Design a protein around this ligand. Structure first.
Ligand SMILES: Cc1cc2nc3c(=O)[nH]c(=O)nc-3n(C[C@H](O)[C@H](O)[C@H](O)COP(=O)(O)OP(=O)(O)OC[C@H]3O[C@@H](n4cnc5c(N)ncnc54)[C@H](O)[C@@H]3O)c2cc1C
Ligand code: SF4
Ligand code: SF4
Lengths: 662, 166
C-alpha cells in the first residue's frame, strides 16, 4: 500500500559492472545516419583496414530505432533529372537564406545513389506506368519498371517521391546489419558523455554509456567516431499534456543527445536559434498534403475564407527583400499567416474534407475512387498511425467530417525542414571557401568533421544544411563512413587516454541511482521526496519553463530578451537540481540522462535566439523586441563553442558565403 | 498508448527474445517474469509507432488511442506479413475500412550489401565506393556576407567617416 514498498517496474538497477571497449571506429546511434555510415565504412575497411575494430551502439534495437520507426510514405530528397543547384536554391528559400550551401550541394550529388540502393534492397517505389497513372512498388516490379531502369517516380513535388515505406527502416537496418554483423552491433545501450583526449588538445578519445537490460557501465575508447542520435523533441510543452505527451510529430525519444554530447565536449555549434514548427492535423499531427492535392481540400477559418489570400499583405516586407516572391512562400511564413487567424480568435483553422470529397467523387469512377482513397489513407498507415487512430476514434472518415490544422510545439532538428546543429566541414574543393573547411592538426581536411579533431556527425547532427530527409541522412552517413576509415589510417597508431578513471565515470553515470538510494528513507513515497527529483518531474519543470519563456505554444511562439532572461534564471536552478536527479530502475536512469540532454540543448537553443537580434524565422518564433529581419547586422550564421575547462559558452557571428547564384 | 491482452500473451516461451520488449524504440515494453505477461511501463511516452503491435507473435498488443484527447471505440489493427501489410480500421460508430499495401519486394534477411558492387577506390577523393564521378556547381561564387558591426550610422566630421585609420 505504502508507495515506497511498490515494485519499480523497470529492469532492476544495482551496482554496475563496468565493461571497457578498445575500438578503432565507434558509431553512436543507429538511425538513418549511422546505417549509412556503417554500410560505407565496412567496405572501405574490408579493403584497407580489415583488422580495424568497428562498433555501432544504439539506445534501442537497430531494426526499428529512430524517426523511421513506423516507416514513411515518401522519400523527400531525390534529384533525378534535377540539378543540385536548384536543390540548394530551394533549401535556401525555405530556410530563410542563411544556409551552408556547400554542405547542401555536396549532399545533392550523393543522395540519389542511396535511393537507388534502397530500391535494390527491397523498398517498394512508385513509378508512372505510361498513361501517367500510378503503380505501387510491387506492381512496378511486376511490370518491370524501376528507378534502376530510369522510369520516373510518382512524385508529389519537384523533389519528393512516393514509396510503400512501412518497412523502410528495417530494410536499411538490414543492410547495416549484414555489413557489420551481430558482433560489431551492440544494441540497447545508451551513451551519455563523450570523452576527449588527455594528451593532444581538442581531440576526441572516447564515450561513456550504460546497458538498458543489465547493470553495466560501458567505457569506449576510440580513434574516430560519429555521433548521430537524431534531433530534440519534448523540449517544449506539447498541446496534449496527459497521455498525449507521447504523441509528438517527431519521435518522442529524441532527447537532444547529438547536440549536447558534442557541444559539451567543445565542438562548434551552429544555427541553434533555428527551430521547426510544422502545421499538421490537430492532436494526432498526421500529414495533410495528400488530402490537399489528391482531392483539392483547402484550409478555411471560421468565416470559410482562405486566410492565405486575406493575409497576403503580411508577406510584403519579405518579398520586397526577395524572400518569398510569387507563391513560393517559406514554410515558416506559411504558418505566420496562420497565427494571426489564431491569436485574433478566428479559428479553428479547418480542412473541409466533407464537401471537397463529394465534389471530386463526381468526376471519378467508383474503382478510380478506391485507388485515390487508398493512396491518401496510406499516408497515415505508412507514416503516422496515431492519426488514423484519432480518426477511427472521432468518427472522422474524411467522407463525413473534416479536420483541424494546428501548428505544433517547436522541434529542434537539422535533417528535416530545420537546420540547427553542429558546425561540420566542407569537402575540400575549389568551390568550397576556406572558412567552410575544418582541416586537422595534420593539415588535411576530412568531410563533415566537427571542430573537435576526430569527431563526426551527420543527419540532424550537422546544422545549417537542412532538407536532407531520409535519403540525405543516409547519404551523409555514407560520406562520413568513408572519412572515418580514411582518418583511422592517417592516425593508425593513436592510443587514446582519459583524464578521468573508470570508477569516476561509473559514479557519474549512476549518480541518480545513489541519489535515490541515499535519500529514499526520507519519505513514505518515492516520488514526493525532498532529497532528490523524479525524472518525470524534471521533464515537466523544464518544458514548462521553455514554453513560458522560450517561445512555446502557450505564448504564441513569442519571446524577448526579458522573457529569455527569466527563463535562464530558472534554467540554472534546474541545472543545479539535475545533480539531485533520482532513478528507481534502469528505465528511470535512461530518462534521467535524456532529460539532462534535453536541458543542455533547449538552453543552447535559447542562448542562440537571445543572441540573434532579429526575428529570422517569423511564424516559427518571434523576438518581440526585434520583430523584423535585418540583413545589415545579422546576415550570417550564429555559432557557439563551449569551454569544458572554464564552463563557459562563447556565442559569436560566423560569416555566410553565397555560392549558388540567384 | 499500447496495452497487452493477458489472455493472449504467453511471455514468449521459446526463442528467448521478448519480441515487444526487444523492439520498442522507447524502452516501454517490459515483461513480468513471474506472470509471463508483458506491459507498457510508461504509456505517456508512447509514440504509438506500432513496432511492438506488429512484432507480437500472439498479437496480444492493441492500441488504445491517447485517452486525454481521443474518444473510445476506435482502433487500428495491422497484420504485417512477409511482403505485405493489411490494415483494418474499426470506427467508434461501427464502420470498418480495410487496406492492403506492399512493404518489401525482396525476401527478409537477403540483402547482400556489396555483392556485385565495385571495390573501395581512392581514399583521397570524395567518391563513395559505388560512384565513379560527381557533379560540380554550375557557377560557384565565393562572396562573403560582411556585417556592419558598428552600433551607429552616426558621423560627426564633415567627411564621410570611411577611412577610419585611428
Ligand atoms: C513524422 C516524420 C515524418 C517524416 N517524413 C519523411 C518523409 O516523408 N520523407 C523523408 O525523406 N524523410 C522523412 N522524415 C525525416 C527523416 O526521418 C529524418 O530526416 C531521418 O530519419 C534522420 O535520421 P537520423 O540520422 O537523425 O537518425 P534517426 O532516424 O533520427 O535515429 C536516431 C538514432 O539514434 C539513436 N539514439 C538516440 N539517442 C541515443 C543515445 N544517446 N545513445 C545511443 N543512441 C541514441 C536512436 O536509437 C536512433 O537509432 C520524417 C520524420 C518524421 C519523424
Ligand atoms: S511479444 Fe506479445 S506475447 Fe510476447 S511478451 Fe510481448 S505482448 Fe506478450
Ligand atoms: S507503440 Fe511503439 S513506442 Fe509505443 S510501446 Fe509500442 S513499440 Fe514502444
Amino acid at each position: 500500500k505504502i508507495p515506497s514498498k511498490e515494485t519499480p517496474r523497470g529492469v532492476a538497477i544495482a551496482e554496475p559492472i563496468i565493461v571497457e571497449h578498445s575500438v578503432d571506429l565507434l558509431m553512436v546511434g543507429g538511425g538513418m545516419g549511422n546505417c549509412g555510415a556503417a554500410f560505407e565504412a565496412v567496405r572501405w575497411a574490408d579493403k584497407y583496414a580489415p583488422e580495424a575494430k568497428i562498433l555501432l551502439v544504439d539506445k534501442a534495437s537497430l531494426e526499428r530505432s529512430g524517426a523511421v520507426a513506423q516507416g514513411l510514405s515518401a522519400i523527400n530528397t531525390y534529384l533525378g533529372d534535377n540539378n543540385a543547384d536548384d536543390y540548394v536554391r530551394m533549401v535556401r528559400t525555405d530556410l530563410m537564406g542563411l544556409v551552408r550551401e556547400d554542405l547542401i550541394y555536396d549532399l545533392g550529388r550523393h543522395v540519389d545513389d542511396s535511393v537507388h540502393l534502397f530500391e535494390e534492397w527491397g523498398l517498394p517505389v512508385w513509378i508512372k506506368d505510361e498513361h501517367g497513372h500510378n503503380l505501387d512498388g510491387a506492381q512496378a516490379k511486376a511490370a518491370g519498371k524501376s528507378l534502376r531502369n530510369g522510369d520516373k517516380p510518382v512524385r508529389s513535388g519537384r523533389w519528393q517521391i512516393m514509396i510503400n515505406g512501412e518497412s523502410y527502416k528495417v530494410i536499411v537496418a538490414e543492410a547495416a546489419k549484414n555489413a557489420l554483423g551481430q558482433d560489431r552491433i551492440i544494441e540497447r545501450i545508451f551513451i551519455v558523455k563523450l570523452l576527449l583526449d588527455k594528451n593532444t588538445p581538442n581531440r576526441i578519445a572516447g564515450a561513456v554509456g550504460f546497458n538498458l537490460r543489465a547493470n553495466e557501465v560501458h567505457i569506449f575508447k576510440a580513434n574516430a567516431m560519429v555521433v548521430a542520435c537524431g534531433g530534440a523533441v519534448n523540449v517544449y510543452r506539447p498541446r496534449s499534456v496527459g497521455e498525449g505527451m507521447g504523441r509528438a510529430w517527431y519521435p518522442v525519444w529524441n532527447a537532444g543527445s547529438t547536440y549536447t554530447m558534442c557541444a559539451q565536449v567543445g565542438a562548434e555549434m551552429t544555427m541553434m536559434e533555428n527551430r521547426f514548427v510544422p502545421a499538421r492535423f490537430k492532436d494526432g499531427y498526421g500529414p495533410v498534403g495528400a488530402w490537399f492535392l489528391l482531392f483539392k481540400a483547402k484550409a478555411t477559418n471560421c468565416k470559410g475564407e482562405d486566410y492565405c489570400a486575406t493575409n497576403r499583405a503580411m508577406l510584403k516586407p519579405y518579398e520586397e527583400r526577395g524572400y518569398a516572391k510569387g507563391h513560393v512562400i517559406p514554410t515558416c511564413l506559411r504558418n505566420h499567416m496562420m497565427l494571426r487567424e489564431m491569436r485574433e480568435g478566428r479559428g479553428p483553422i479547418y480542412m473541409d474534407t466533407k464537401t471537397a470529397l463529394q465534389t471530386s467523387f463526381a468526376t471519378m469512377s467508383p474503382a478510380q475512387q478506391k485507388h485515390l482513397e487508398a493512396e491518401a489513407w496510406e499516408d497515415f498507415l505508412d507514416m503516422c498511425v496515431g492519426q488514423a487512430n484519432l480518426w477511427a476514434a472521432t468518427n472522422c472518415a474524411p467522407e463525413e467530417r473534416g479536420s483541424e490544422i494546428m501548428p505544433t510545439e517547436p522541434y529542434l532538428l537539422g535533417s528535416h525542414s530545420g537546420c540547427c546543429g553542429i558546425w561540420a566541414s566542407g569537402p575540400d574543393e575549389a568551390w568550397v571557401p576556406e572558412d567552410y573547411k575544418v582541416r586537422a592538426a595534420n593539415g588535411k581536411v576530412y568531410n563533415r568533421m566537427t571542430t573537435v579533431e576526430g569527431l563526426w556527425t551527420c543527419a540532424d547532427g550537422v546544422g545549417a544544411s537542412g532538407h536532407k530527409f531520409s535519403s540525405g541522412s543516409h547519404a551523409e552517413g555514407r560520406i562520413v563512413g568513408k572519412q572515418m576509415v580514411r582518418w583511422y589510417l592517417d592516425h593508425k597508431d593513436f592510443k587514446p587516454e582519459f583524464v578521468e578513471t573508470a570508477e569516476e565515470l561509473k559514479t557519474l553515470i549512476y549518480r541518480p541511482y545513489y541519489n535515490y538510494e541515499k535519500g529514499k528513507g526520507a519519505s513514505t513515497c518515492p516520488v514526493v521526496n525532498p532529497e532528490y527529483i523524479s525524472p518525470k518531474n524534471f521533464m515537466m519543470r523544464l518544458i514548462k519553463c521553455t514554453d513560458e519563456y522560450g517561445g512555446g505554444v502557450g505564448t504564441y511562439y513569442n519571446t524577448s530578451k526579458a522573457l529569455l532572461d527569466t527563463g535562464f534564471w530558472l534554467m540554472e536552478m534546474l541545472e543545479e537540481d539535475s545533480l539531485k536527479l533520482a532513478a528507481r530502475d534502469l528505465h528511470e536512469l535512461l530518462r534521467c540522462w535524456e532529460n539532462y540532454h534535453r536541458l543542455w540543448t533547449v538552453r543552447l537553443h535559447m542562448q542562440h535566439i537571445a543572441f540573434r537580434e532579429e526575428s529570422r524565422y517569423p511564424g516559427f518564433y518571434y523576438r518581440a523586441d526585434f520583430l523584423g529581419l535585418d540583413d545589415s547586422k545579422w546576415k550570417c550564421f550564429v555559432n557557439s563553442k563551449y569551454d569544458p575547462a572554464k564552463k563557459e559558452t562563447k556565442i559569436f557571428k560566423k560569416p555566410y558565403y553565397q555560392i549558388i547564384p540567384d | 498508448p499500447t496495452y497487452v491482452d493477458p489472455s493472449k500473451c504467453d511471455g514468449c516461451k521459446g526463442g528467448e527474445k521478448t519480441a515487444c520488449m526487444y523492439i520498442c524504440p522507447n524502452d516501454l515494453m517490459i515483461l513480468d517474469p513471474e506472470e509471463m505477461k508483458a506491459f507498457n511501463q510508461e504509456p505517456e511516452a508512447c509514440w504509438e509507432c506500432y513496432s511492438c503491435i506488429k512484432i507480437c507473435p500472439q498479437g496480444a498488443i492493441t492500441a488504445r488511442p491517447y485517452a486525454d484527447f481521443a474518444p473510445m471505440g476506435g482502433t487500428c489493427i495491422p497484420l504485417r506479413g512477409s511482403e505485405d501489410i493489411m490494415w483494418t480500421i474499426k470506427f467508434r460508430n461501427g464502420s470498418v475500412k480495410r487496406f492492403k499495401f506492399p512493404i518489401r519486394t525482396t525476401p527478409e534477411g537477403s540483402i547482400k550489401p556489396f555483392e556485385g558492387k565495385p571495390e573501395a577506390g581512392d581514399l583521397e577523393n570524395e567518391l563513395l565506393f559505388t560512384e565513379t564521378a560527381l557533379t560540380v556547381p554550375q557557377v560557384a561564387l565565393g562572396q562573403k556576407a560582411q556585417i556592419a558591426d558598428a552600433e551607429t550610422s552616426q558621423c560627426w566630421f564633415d567627411l564621410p567617416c570611411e577611412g577610419g585609420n585611428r
